[PDB]
Design an enzyme around this catalytic site. Structure first.
Site, PDB file in Angstrom:
ATOM      1  N   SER A 130      48.348  41.519  40.711  1.00 48.25           N
ATOM      2  CA  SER A 130      48.006  43.034  41.005  1.00 48.25           C
ATOM      3  C   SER A 130      47.607  43.127  42.546  1.00 48.25           C
ATOM      4  CB  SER A 130      47.246  43.292  40.261  1.00 48.25           C
ATOM      5  OG  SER A 130      47.654  43.596  38.270  1.00 48.25           O
TER       6      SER A 130
ATOM      7  N   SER B 243      44.500  49.786  38.047  1.00 50.90           N
ATOM      8  CA  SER B 243      45.697  48.802  38.526  1.00 50.90           C
ATOM      9  C   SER B 243      46.505  49.348  37.498  1.00 50.90           C
ATOM     10  CB  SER B 243      45.212  47.389  37.653  1.00 50.90           C
ATOM     11  OG  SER B 243      45.653  46.474  39.153  1.00 50.90           O
TER      12      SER B 243
ATOM     13  N   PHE C  17      46.456  39.206  37.136  1.00 52.32           N
ATOM     14  CA  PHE C  17      46.279  38.503  36.204  1.00 52.32           C
ATOM     15  C   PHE C  17      48.200  38.501  36.057  1.00 52.32           C
ATOM     16  CE2 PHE C  17      46.395  38.873  30.711  1.00 52.32           C
ATOM     17  CZ  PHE C  17      46.413  37.109  30.895  1.00 52.32           C
TER      18      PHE C  17
ATOM     19  N   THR D 265      41.193  42.943  41.538  1.00 53.84           N
ATOM     20  CA  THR D 265      41.442  41.548  40.271  1.00 53.84           C
ATOM     21  C   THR D 265      43.339  41.768  40.547  1.00 53.84           C
ATOM     22  OG1 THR D 265      41.335  43.426  38.401  1.00 53.84           O
ATOM     23  CG2 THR D 265      39.891  42.104  39.443  1.00 53.84           C
TER      24      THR D 265
ATOM     25  N   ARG E  35      36.957  35.061  35.858  1.00 53.33           N
ATOM     26  CA  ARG E  35      37.451  35.241  37.455  1.00 53.33           C
ATOM     27  C   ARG E  35      37.137  36.117  38.335  1.00 53.33           C
ATOM     28  NH1 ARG E  35      42.250  40.260  36.450  1.00 53.33           N
ATOM     29  NH2 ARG E  35      40.716  41.460  35.191  1.00 53.33           N
TER      30      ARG E  35
END
Ligand SMILES: *C(=O)N1C[C@H](NOS(=O)(=O)O)CC[C@H]1C(N)=O
Ligand code: NA
Ligand code: NA
Ligand code: NA
Ligand code: NA
Ligand code: NA
Length: 247
Positions: free
Chosen positions: A49, A97, A190, A188, A232
């Site tokens: 992302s 996101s 993942f 962020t 994270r």
């Protein structure tokens, strides 16, 4: 990038959690960076992302995103996360996101223009193989933490090969904390839990503007269990706090 120095004392925050990962932190005024793991700082991973940053710029540059106020409408059909099942602005789509919004942006950009802009941006290995809507999710594109901080510094300076207006639009969409003399821009990512012997990657990248200083940062870690995802943010936050970088 300027100079980079390995500081293995920053591994304290990683060993405590049995995390294999890297943090890169650069102070603009001194043209110098530090990392817990020099070797990993240059290793390249799926952007996941975090790719919304270049993709949003490219979408604006190519006109696929018509302007800063475009609304991305939900067709009413199932999406993978409930938070995406709504109409979204550009900033809302980045902040929640919303993958399907950005997959359609990429489709409309197309392979030729996407390749063009990733080469102009020196974005990772610049390999867009794996399908126009998923090369950064499950295909062959890879980028390192060092290259993330270089790309983000260019964005901060409005020095990417894109209009200044389009860089500014994407910058406001990335603000995640705003105070009078402290401003954070961040994203962020993942990629998932990977497969046997082949972990996924989790990311947190961004920059901090504190008084007149600017700090660029990129964190990644191997991940095979979603319960570990908040590390994270917590590991880089603890390192930045130990450096005095705080509201
Ligand atoms: C991006 O990495 N993805 C979309 C969404 N991002 O949320 S995150 O930034 O909090 O990681 C969920 C994870 C991931 C995906 N499923 O593609
Ligand atoms: Na620097
Ligand atoms: Na990877
Ligand atoms: Na402040
Ligand atoms: Na792992
Ligand atoms: Na520390």
């Amino acid at each position: 990038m300027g100079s980079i120095t390995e500081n293995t004392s920053w591994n304290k925050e990683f060993s405590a959690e049995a995390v294999n990962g890297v943090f890169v932190l650069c102070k603009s005024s001194s043209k110098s960076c530090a990392t817990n793991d020099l070797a990993r700082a240059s290793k390249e991973y799926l952007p996941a992302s975090t790719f919304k940053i270049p993709n949003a710029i490219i979408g604006l540059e190519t006109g696929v995103i018509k302007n800063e106020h475009q609304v991305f409408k939900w067709d009413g059909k199932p999406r993978a996360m409930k938070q995406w099942e709504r109409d979204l602005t550009l900033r809302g789509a980045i902040q929640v996101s919303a993958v399907p919004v950005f997959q359609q942006i990429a489709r409309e950009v197309g392979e030729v223009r996407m390749q063009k802009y990733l080469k102009k941006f020196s974005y990772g290995n610049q390999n867009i193989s794996g399908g126009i809507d998923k090369f950064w999710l499950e295909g062959q594109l890879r980028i390192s933490a060092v290259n993330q901080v270089e790309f983000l510094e260019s964005l901060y300076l409005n020095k990417l090969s894109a209009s200044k207006e389009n860089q500014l639009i994407v910058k406001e969409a990335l603000v995640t904390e705003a105070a009078p003399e402290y401003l954070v821009h961040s994203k962020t990512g993942f990629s998932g839990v990977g497969t046997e012997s082949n972990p996924g990657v989790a990311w947190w990248v961004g920059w901090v503007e504190k008084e007149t200083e600017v700090y660029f940062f990129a964190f990644n870690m191997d991940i095979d269990n979603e319960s570990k995802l908040p590390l994270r943010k917590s590991i880089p936050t603890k390192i930045m706090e130990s450096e005095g970088i705080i509201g």
